[PDB]
Design a binder for this molecule. Structure first.
Ligand SMILES: CCNC(=O)[C@H]1O[C@@H](n2cnc3c(N)ncnc32)[C@H](O)[C@@H]1O
Length: 217
């Protein structure tokens, strides 16, 4: 259940965190970009697999703020991940070139992070803990969590609650509490969803005060 990150991943997490220090809100752009890719994959599968979308008939990205819990949630209904995939895909990693590319560019990698497929780690810039709950058609719902010093994966004792997809839950750092603010979230989600071809909603409030999904693109 408990794993260590690959040496290269530790170096990469540090690089990413060190360079994006001043431009932190791109973590949201990167997570949204990953959710898009997840949806594209499931959509490509729905073409050859008639049952692919069985677990969840929708193809969306929903974001919600839990200010009391101090949590940020980014859930997609994409391909999702198996237990093995959570361990390999997040715990392991043009890797060597990217390393030299990043260092020589820090001595704006904001674009070089999205280029390569490692924007997920940028979450650690605003979170102390990152939790990945995911449901894949060929496995049971699992949870991956890490504070960057190690990571573990277990079976979700809650069972299949997603159907299919992934929820990225970020335990926000104290100085990152502005991201629990709906409007701070909407400005960032409306800015980073304008290129995404799947609908992105933010659990917002309207006034008396009812809550519901508000589309962002
Ligand atoms: C190096 C960081 N790891 C990733 O972003 C990879 O992990 C998996 N991943 C990350 N976020 C998601 C997601 N929301 N849905 C599906 N796979 C994901 C993909 O294979 C990514 O390429």
């Amino acid at each position: 259940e408990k794993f260590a990150f690959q040496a290269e991943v530790n170096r990469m997490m540090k690089l990413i965190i060190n360079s994006l220090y001043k431009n932190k809100e791109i973590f949201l752009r990167e997570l949204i970009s990953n959710a898009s890719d997840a949806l594209d994959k499931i959509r490509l599968i729905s073409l050859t697999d008639e049952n692919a979308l069985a677990g969840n008939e929708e193809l969306t990205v929903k974001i919600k703020c839990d200010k009391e819990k101090n949590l940020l949630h980014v859930t997609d209904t994409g391909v999702g991940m198996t237990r093995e995939e959570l361990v390999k895909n997040l715990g392991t990693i043009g890797t060597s070139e990217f390393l030299n590319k990043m260092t020589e560019a820090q001595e704006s990698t904001s674009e070089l992070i999205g280029q390569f497929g490692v924007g997920f780690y940028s979450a650690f810039l605003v979170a102390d803990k990152v939790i990945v709950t995911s449901k894949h058609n060929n496995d049971t719902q699992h949870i991956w969590e890490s504070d960057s010093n190690e990571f573990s994966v277990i079976a979700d004792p809650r069972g299949n609650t997603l159907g299919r997809g992934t929820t990225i839950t970020l335990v926000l750092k104290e100085e990152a509490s502005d991201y629990l603010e709906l409007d701070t979230i909407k400005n960032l989600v409306k800015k980073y969803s304008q290129f995404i071809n799947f609908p992105i909603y933010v659990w917002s409030s309207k006034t008396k005060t009812v809550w519901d999904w508000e589309l962002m693109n």
